[PDB]
Design a protein around this ligand. Structure first.
Ligand SMILES: *[C@@H]1O[C@H](CO)[C@@H](O)[C@H](O)[C@H]1NC(C)=O
Ligand SMILES: *[C@@H]1O[C@H](CO)[C@@H](O)[C@H](O)[C@H]1NC(C)=O
Length: 437
């Protein structure tokens, strides 16, 4: 992608902290960039290169031609995308009106104006605070890690002239082909609009990546899900090599589209995560995610992922799995194997390396994503509600939340909750047990 000049790109700044065993935590300055896919893509004096879910056929006949012709540009974070920052806090609004109608956003935490803040959390812990009280079923405020390049693909693909500044170089375990710019080129070739989503379509190329879903939730449900890949860093895909939820064969690819999820509701305890419940979604909460290794050091193999919450001065641990025979409250090899077994989902997790593989991604740098969206693929029924909708409720793994099968249809949630939003704050990174108590 090339760089336009109609608006300057100003990242709204955010603080976060780095802790030590003490409990002492030092303040680190950072800033937030919107994903390139939400940007206006225009010609020298555009004239859109991309409107709705369809490219400009004259401006973008090919990837090479479109790369010559089209430019990324600066984003008005508040007035257009509903994005603001407040000391340690970031807020993302769902529906924001201006010249156009914006639905949600995907953003990344940057260290400086040109580079993503890489995190190294193997044997470490990652903590943050979140307000999901103004979210409802159908919505998903996601906070997660991906194996992106610090620079946004500039070093590997010089034709990319914008880089991490303009939020380029995205990838994940879904190996997504909806990205307009992949690897220094456009992805207009072989574009097919989405069947239900009027904003997205899919080109002949995708962007594979490891993915550690720390947090995907609304006020009714949450999910912690590692997604390993055969190879860890950003790999490009051709069309049907991809796999992923978007494609027609989701498992014919190099990454795991499902992951080893832990959802308390899905694992049996239906009075743990929700409004007025053990972990009370009506109020702000701290979300701790430890990453235990073999030797308890930063160099060992990822043995376990532990979840602790902190609310109102009380440490509250992850609730157990009452599913037989799926034991514990931690994500491990043995838990994941029995999970996939007992639930009857394809064990794509192990096929692509499992937790060992996911540790390897974490061993290298991974970038922090903060996002908020509704789901056009599955109406978010895999997070809240019963999935698949046809199967019996009481069948193990079917019920993931207390929400209707009929809810979460994008048109309804966009019509119902235009003032909905998420709040991410109080981001701390340090040794196990160093970011709370
Ligand atoms: C951003 O941080 C990276 C990593 O240290 C560095 O390579 C780059 O030069 C930085 N940019 C600055 C300080 O302007
Ligand atoms: C649900 O989880 C909570 C939190 O650990 C626990 O106190 C409660 O016993 C669980 N419910 C059942 C039926 O075990």
């Amino acid at each position: 992608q090339k760089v336009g000049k109609f608006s300057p790109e100003v990242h709204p700044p955010i603080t976060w902290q780095e802790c030590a065993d003490d409990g002492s935590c030092k303040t680190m300055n950072g800033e937030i960039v919107i994903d390139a896919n939400w940007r206006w893509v225009h010609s020298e004096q555009g004239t859109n290169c991309y409107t709705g879910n369809t490219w400009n056929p004259t401006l973008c006949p090919d990837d090479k031609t479109c790369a010559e012709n089209c430019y990324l540009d600066g984003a008005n974070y508040e007035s257009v995308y509903g994005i603001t920052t407040e000391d340690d806090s970031v807020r993302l609004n769902f529906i924001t009106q201006s010249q156009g109608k914006n639905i949600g956003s995907r953003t990344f935490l940057m260290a400086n104006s040109t580079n993503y803040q890489m995190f190294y959390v193997l044997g470490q812990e990652f903590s943050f605070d979140v307000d999901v009280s103004n979210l409802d079923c159908g919505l998903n405020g996601a906070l997660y890690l991906v194996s992106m390049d610090s620079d946004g693909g500039i070093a590997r693909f010089p034709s990319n002239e914008a880089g991490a500044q303009y939020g380029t170089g995205y990838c994940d375990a879904q190996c997504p082909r909806d990205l307009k710019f992949i690897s220094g080129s456009a992805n207009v070739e072989g574009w097919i609009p989405s069947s239900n989503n009027p904003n997205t379509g899919y080109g002949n190329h995708g962007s594979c990546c490891a993915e550690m879903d720390l947090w995907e939730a609304n006020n009714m449900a949450t999910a912690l899900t590692p997604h390993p890949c055969d190879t860890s860093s950003q790999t490009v895909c051709e069309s049907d090599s991809c796999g992923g939820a978007t494609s027609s064969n989701r498992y014919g690819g190099l990454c795991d589209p499902d992951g080893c999820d832990y959802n308390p509701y899905r694992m049996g305890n239906t009075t743990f995560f929700g409004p007025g419940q053990t972990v009370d979604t009506k109020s702000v909460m701290t979300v701790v995610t430890q990453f235990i290794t073999n030797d308890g050091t930063t160099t060992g193999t990822l043995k376990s992922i532990k979840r602790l919450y902190v609310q109102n001065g009380q440490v509250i641990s992850q609730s157990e799995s009452t599913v037989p025979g799926v034991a514990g409250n931690e994500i491990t090899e043995d838990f994941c194997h029995n999970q996939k077994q007992v639930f009857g989902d394809k064990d794509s997790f192990t096929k692509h390396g499992g937790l060992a593989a996911m540790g390897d991604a974490l061993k290298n740098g991974m970038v922090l994503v903060l996002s908020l969206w509704d789901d056009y693929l599955a109406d978010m029924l895999w997070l809240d509600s019963n999935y698949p909708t046809t199967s019996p409720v009481t069948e193990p793994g079917v019920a993931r939340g207390p929400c209707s099968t009929s809810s979460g249809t994008p048109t309804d949630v966009e019509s119902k909750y235009p003032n909905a939003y998420v709040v991410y704050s109080n981001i701390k990174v340090g040794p196990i047990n160093s970011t709370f108590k």
